[PDB]
Amino acid sequence: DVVMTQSPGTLSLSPGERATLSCRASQSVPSSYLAWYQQKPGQAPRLLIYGASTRATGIPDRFSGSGSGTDFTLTISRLEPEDFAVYYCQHYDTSPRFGGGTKVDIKRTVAAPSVFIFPPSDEQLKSGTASVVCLLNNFYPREAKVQWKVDNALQSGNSQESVTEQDSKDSTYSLSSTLTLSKADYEKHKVYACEVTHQGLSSPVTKSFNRGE
Amino acid sequence: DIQMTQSPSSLSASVGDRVTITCRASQSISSYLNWYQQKPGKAPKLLIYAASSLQSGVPSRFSGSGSGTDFTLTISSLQPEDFATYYCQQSYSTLALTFGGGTKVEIKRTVAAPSVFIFPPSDEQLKSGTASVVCLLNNFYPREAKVQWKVDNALQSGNSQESVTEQDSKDSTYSLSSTLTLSKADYEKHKVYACEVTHQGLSSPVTKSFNRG
Amino acid sequence: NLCPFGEVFNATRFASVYAWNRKRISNCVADYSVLYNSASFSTFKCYGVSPTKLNDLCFTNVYADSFVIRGDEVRQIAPGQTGTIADYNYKLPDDFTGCVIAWNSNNLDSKVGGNYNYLYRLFRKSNLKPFERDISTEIYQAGSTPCNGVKGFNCYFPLQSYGFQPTYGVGYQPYRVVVLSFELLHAPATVCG
Amino acid sequence: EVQLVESGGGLIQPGGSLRLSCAASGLTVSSNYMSWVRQAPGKGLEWVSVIYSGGSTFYADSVKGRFTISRDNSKNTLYLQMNSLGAEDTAVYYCARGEGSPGNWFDPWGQGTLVTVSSASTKGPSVFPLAPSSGTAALGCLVKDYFPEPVTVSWNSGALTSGVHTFPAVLQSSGLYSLSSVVTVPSSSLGTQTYICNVNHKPSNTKVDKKVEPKSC
Amino acid sequence: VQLVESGGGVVQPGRSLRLSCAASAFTFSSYDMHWVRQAPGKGLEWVAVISYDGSNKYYADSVKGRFTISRDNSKNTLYLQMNSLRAEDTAVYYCAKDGGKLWVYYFDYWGQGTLVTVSSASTKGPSVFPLAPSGTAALGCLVKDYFPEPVTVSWNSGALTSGVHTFPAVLQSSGLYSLSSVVTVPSSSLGTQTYICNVNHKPSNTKVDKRVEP
Ligand SMILES: *[C@@H]1O[C@H](CO)[C@@H](O)[C@H](O)[C@H]1NC(C)=O
């Protein structure tokens, strides 16, 4: 039984840079027993490097592993936006053991979000509930503030947000804020708006619609 | 390592009854299974060796059987001196000799109601700094008795430690003493000190309590 | 004359576990007392018989099996065990009667560059029978398409190398194992203690 | 053409039992090391059990006594029977060939299935459109009030993939999940291109197709 | 056939202790000898074994590289050297003659055993606290803050036998032991009959008598 530890927890590097992921062990472990796995969001882990240094079939040349004894290193040279994933080391003593994993975030230029507002469907309104959805599309960094204003009154405690992972192609985030009201409450008001403040925006952007129009 | 599992952990039988103890092994130990008897405070004594062979001097009422993983010790006619703990010990792994959990043979009797008494901490104890509240359950059967401490009608657990006397040689009854240990600063903070008792020979939980002072 | 246990224990080179060696010991007087107090052993477990009782017992034949395995695999050399070594390399029966003796051999069987001479069988369709030796090197077929003697996808060489290095942890260090089997037939015994 | 296809996941009450399947093509399950690796939400990977080609099975201490790995040679399928399930067993379970040892790594892996251990009940989703308004336009689907996870949303049965964003499910205060799937399209193709989102809630076999069209004022 | 042990006692952690066990009435120079311990309130655990001539020694994995077994055939005695003792070693140690009727080990004769308690706690004394009642009554004494086991409690110097109940001790969070002992007496003879509990702590050589009155 040998305990492996990966470092760092998260890594943030721009595209084209060299990534260095470590997997240190308390005792000395044979290099032939060390392996690396890549897991992209929403997918199954994929064998990346086995035997500490041997590259798996179909794995790009920019992935390479090295090290021996107590310090095994995975290197991702010429980093790409599609390399956004969590990487685990793995070894065997008396049972298969994985490391805690290392997240690889990908830096990119500031991107202002494209804002879209969506009224509730009449189909949902017949059910007795109104869901108003505000979309922040393809921005960076993740820090963004979304404010709901119903008839120019700031709303609080009736909206939930959801953020996507970093995009595997442009390395941006997307956010959806859903305002939820009852049908009776939804008809009581006319103007529905979400205001967006982001680093890529010189001034807050507001998207709105008038109920019935 | 070879683990020996005995069943049951305890039994209640009267003089003349037929007792059969079971002893299972985590793997086949062939026929190398020994039985031992240990009186309270005395050393163990050999009864059956090699599953079924009777040791010299051991009474004829003792007999063993079994092979592989299941083994049985049988007392054809129980006697008043045969109330003790009975261990099984495998000898197949001669350099890793393991024992069983043990099976305590106990005297069977009628269900007796416990006599509950509560005691406040003495004045010589508050002078030192500590404060122990002792509750007594006297002469009852079976052993399974629940003792609950209520300080100002608040359930107490972890502040006391129970202790049970062995089965009495005259009336075969048990006894329980729970010592609610607490500091002096925790004693004058409250007022009511109760002792709730739940037993098979009680139609309703009996509580003996007192007020501080 | 005495039984040649020294030729097995003090052997300068050991066999791989998949091709474990066996010495048949017959027609001699075995001196178990001096044998068990010679070297220092990391593992000494006997089954069905006691080490001090062997001096008083006679057997028709005595077998001495010897091989090398990993440190973390010594627990598989015992009755009723499972694993890559016990299933595919060296298997002991459930009613095994004998002794398992192992000791750390990092100073003998590990090289600074890695000692890849000790192999074990990684792939096998079925488990071994007790005391069954399989020295086959036929390409293992893990898929529907047959291999025809060429290693490829779903076509694996059955043996895997250990690769011992002196600075590895003890779980990964080489251990030399000697298993003493005591055969008792309805024949005149030739080996006595 | 080597695939490991998994099934059997979903909702199960605490203390209940479940049986996952791993149908293989491209390898013989009875001839390989076959393992199960689970991953609790937001957490790392954990090896669960393995079965040898010779029949021996092994389990991690966190599941010993409750899980039983098996296989069916005629169906060429790996199985994992899970009993006495609790909250600590809620995870995505993967099957894989190998055991993570030299010459025997985890390869290939299955797509994984999600086991949710809760006292709640399975509820199918409702799908509502997110209609665009009057350079580039954005439309989407709102999948609301389903349990448990997951739901999968595609657009035009896979023909529309660029610009699609499906957000993680948020646990509403009612105990039911809700997510939105949006996609950005050029404004010119709103009237000359039909957009249909394809919502699949596996735990309830609920497959909903929603056409998203602009609304006429 | 008898086996007599000695050498047990109290020992601080890391120190050493040597136990002995003398045999009689059998060919001691041809039988194997064992040592088996049992923690207070726990089961039995085989410890070590030595050959008939003393050349072969085999230990359990819990005491390996830490205990040592030896014997002297010309004197028919057996020993057990216990070095670097931990708190878990606290148990009653028995020596056992090996029955020679099988190819395997089995203990056909044991010795009475000797208690070995391991800790650095000082040998303190008891603090007797009367338990006054508030349909018979009950009164008792408390044996608190002492180390190690055991303590002997009696009433009226052994004159009050019926109705007495002495309970086991419990190792409280500090490390010392706390023991309770009570006796139920009729409520009529409370001011006429005298009750005095006799607490004796042999490890600390302390004997305390205390009166119990309402
Ligand atoms: C191996 O050689 C040593 C001396 O180097 C000797 O003491 C020992 O008895 C030998 N082993 C055997 C089994 O004879």
PDB file of N, CA and C and ligand atoms in Angstrom, chain C residues 5-6 9-10 35 38, ligand 1:
ATOM      1  N   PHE C   5      18.554 -29.959   1.713  1.00  0.00           N
ATOM      2  CA  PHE C   5      17.769 -28.728   1.731  1.00  0.00           C
ATOM      3  C   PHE C   5      18.616 -27.522   1.346  1.00  0.00           C
ATOM      4  N   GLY C   6      19.922 -27.574   1.617  1.00  0.00           N
ATOM      5  CA  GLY C   6      20.790 -26.461   1.274  1.00  0.00           C
ATOM      6  C   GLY C   6      20.836 -26.170  -0.211  1.00  0.00           C
ATOM      7  N   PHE C   9      17.639 -23.924  -0.635  1.00  0.00           N
ATOM      8  CA  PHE C   9      17.632 -22.627   0.036  1.00  0.00           C
ATOM      9  C   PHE C   9      18.805 -21.763  -0.412  1.00  0.00           C
ATOM     10  N   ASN C  10      20.017 -22.314  -0.380  1.00  0.00           N
ATOM     11  CA  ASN C  10      21.222 -21.564  -0.708  1.00  0.00           C
ATOM     12  C   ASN C  10      21.514 -21.524  -2.207  1.00  0.00           C
ATOM     13  N   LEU C  35      17.817 -26.452   9.742  1.00  0.00           N
ATOM     14  CA  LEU C  35      17.322 -25.782   8.546  1.00  0.00           C
ATOM     15  C   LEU C  35      16.521 -24.532   8.894  1.00  0.00           C
ATOM     16  N   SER C  38      18.644 -21.373  10.314  1.00  0.00           N
ATOM     17  CA  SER C  38      19.763 -20.870   9.528  1.00  0.00           C
ATOM     18  C   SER C  38      19.582 -19.389   9.226  1.00  0.00           C
TER      19      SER C  38
HETATM   20  C1  LIG F   1      23.262 -22.136   3.740  1.00  0.00           C
HETATM   21  O1  LIG F   1      24.616 -21.752   4.008  1.00  0.00           O
HETATM   22  C2  LIG F   1      24.841 -21.310   5.354  1.00  0.00           C
HETATM   23  C3  LIG F   1      26.275 -20.838   5.423  1.00  0.00           C
HETATM   24  O2  LIG F   1      26.527 -19.811   4.473  1.00  0.00           O
HETATM   25  C4  LIG F   1      24.538 -22.447   6.322  1.00  0.00           C
HETATM   26  O3  LIG F   1      24.715 -21.985   7.656  1.00  0.00           O
HETATM   27  C5  LIG F   1      23.109 -22.933   6.120  1.00  0.00           C
HETATM   28  O4  LIG F   1      22.859 -24.069   6.940  1.00  0.00           O
HETATM   29  C6  LIG F   1      22.862 -23.298   4.656  1.00  0.00           C
HETATM   30  N1  LIG F   1      21.470 -23.663   4.454  1.00  0.00           N
HETATM   31  C7  LIG F   1      21.028 -24.924   4.513  1.00  0.00           C
HETATM   32  C8  LIG F   1      19.560 -25.115   4.288  1.00  0.00           C
HETATM   33  O5  LIG F   1      21.781 -25.867   4.736  1.00  0.00           O
END
